[PDB]
């Protein structure tokens, strides 16, 4: 069977960065040519492997993670990076082996009044471990007073909404990001 790569890129709706989606690519043959010869992408950066050598390489599994962020934050999807996205939403390991592909989605994820469905985690006490997904909606305690589940001063909802408007600048415009991670394990390989 052909590898399920179109079902991640051609997807109708993308996930929020705090709840980034992961798909396990297995038991298929992969043709990465649908990717490196495409001009929709503004970022195609591969670490630990060459895109040209991917066709002749085999991995036990592949992991395709998808989310939507701001353009000014796409730089944060890279090893050894800091920021709200890299620290509290999606953290890549320093020894990352895989590719990061990002394209503009102002025609898809923007609304005239502002698309408020895409959310990012704003408040978190500690940085995210690599490939960690935090979906907690617990009220953030910014002081010594316990929140008891009610919002207010020093008691803030952890998730904030991107306002994605077509009139926004490139730095405030929505960008769809897919991160492919190639996993080689002591197991029968299923992706080639």
């Amino acid at each position: 069977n052909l590898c399920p790569f179109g079902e991640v890129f051609n997807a109708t709706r993308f996930a929020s960065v705090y709840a980034w989606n992961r798909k396990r690519i297995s038991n298929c043959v992969a043709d990465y040519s649908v990717l490196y010869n495409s001009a929709s992408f503004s970022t195609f950066k591969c670490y630990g492997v060459s895109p040209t050598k991917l066709n002749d390489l085999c991995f036990t599994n592949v992991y395709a993670d998808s989310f939507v962020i701001r353009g000014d934050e796409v730089r944060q999807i890279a090893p050894g990076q800091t920021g709200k996205i890299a620290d509290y939403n999606y953290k890549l390991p320093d020894d990352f082996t895989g590719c990061v592909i990002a394209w503009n989605s102002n025609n898809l994820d923007s609304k005239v009044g502002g698309n408020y469905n895409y959310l990012y985690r704003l408040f978190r006490k500690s940085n995210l471990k690599p490939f960690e997904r935090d979906i907690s909606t617990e009220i953030y305690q910014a002081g010594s007073t316990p929140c008891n589940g009610v919002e207010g001063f020093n008691c803030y909802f952890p998730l904030q909404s991107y306002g994605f408007q077509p009139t926004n600048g490139v730095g405030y415009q929505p960008y769809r990001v897919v991160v492919l991670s190639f996993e080689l394990l002591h197991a029968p390989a299923t992706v080639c």
Partner: antibody, heavy 117, light 110 residues
Framework: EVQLVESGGGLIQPGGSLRLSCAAS????????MSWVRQAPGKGLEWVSV???????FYADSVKGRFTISRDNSKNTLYLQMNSLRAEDTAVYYC???????????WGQGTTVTVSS | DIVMTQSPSFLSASVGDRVTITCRAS??????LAWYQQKPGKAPKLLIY???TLQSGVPSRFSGSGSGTEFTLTISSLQPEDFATYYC???????????FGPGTKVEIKR
């Protein structure tokens, strides 16, 4: 209850060193975005530095490599170490709590830093 | 980089008038806009966040409107303690974390 008490400003020569302190009351410094913003005499406000709750630090272009943001959790105190000071750094410095879209809501009284030979 | 501008720079009004000041952005910044008030010798006071939401701690006469590149701060009825400088600030920017505007000074008309 909620207050930010600043100290450490004063008169310094170019190329000197200073350390501004901002003691917090009514909020946990380690659990918040803590920012330093300066204002030159007769001019507007300019962001200087920010420290995240997770430890990430960010600095403005004009202060990179010379300024260092830090914090003490036991004392609940923000710190700004200003090295390689120049005359253009002369300003009133404020410590504030940043809430991103919710804005900078809690500000300190500010401390004056004069850099002159 | 996105540049903040404010109009006017000096505004004269009496007590009770409706004062409207405007802040403009080079590119669309959605609703990532804040309005602060500063008096001489004092620290800035946060008035408006999210470009339309009044901070817990502002009177109702203050209001904020706008999206994208044009924003307005409006005082429906001016009060004696409102004579100060007002700053607009773009939020969640890059490279700087936030960018402040030149400021608008409201003074007493006579």
């Amino acid at each position: 209850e909620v207050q930010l008490v600043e100290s450490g400003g004063g008169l310094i020569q170019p190329g000197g060193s200073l350390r501004l302190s901002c003691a917090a009351s009514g909020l946990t410094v380690s659990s918040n975005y803590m920012s330093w913003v300066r204002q030159a005499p007769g001019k507007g406000l300019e962001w200087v530095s920010v420290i995240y709750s997770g430890g990430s630090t960010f600095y403005a272009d004009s202060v990179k490599g010379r300024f260092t943001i830090s914090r003490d959790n036991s004392k609940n105190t923000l710190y700004l170490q200003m090295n390689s000071l120049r005359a253009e750094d002369t300003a009133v410095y404020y410590c504030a709590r940043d809430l991103d879209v919710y804005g900078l809501d809690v500000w300190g009284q500010g401390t004056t830093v004069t850099v002159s030979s | 980089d996105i540049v903040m501008t404010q109009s006017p720079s000096f505004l004269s009004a009496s007590v009770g008038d409706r004062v409207t000041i405007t802040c403009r952005a080079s590119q669309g910044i959605s609703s990532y806009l804040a309005w602060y008030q500063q008096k001489p010798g004092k620290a800035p006071k946060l008035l408006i966040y999210a470009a339309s939401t009044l901070q817990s701690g502002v009177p109702s006469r203050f209001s904020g409107s706008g999206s994208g590149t044009e924003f307005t701060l409006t005082i429906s009825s001016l009060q004696p303690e409102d004579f100060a400088t007002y700053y607009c600030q773009q939020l969640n920017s890059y490279p700087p974390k936030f960018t402040f505007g030149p400021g608008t000074k409201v003074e007493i008309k006579r």
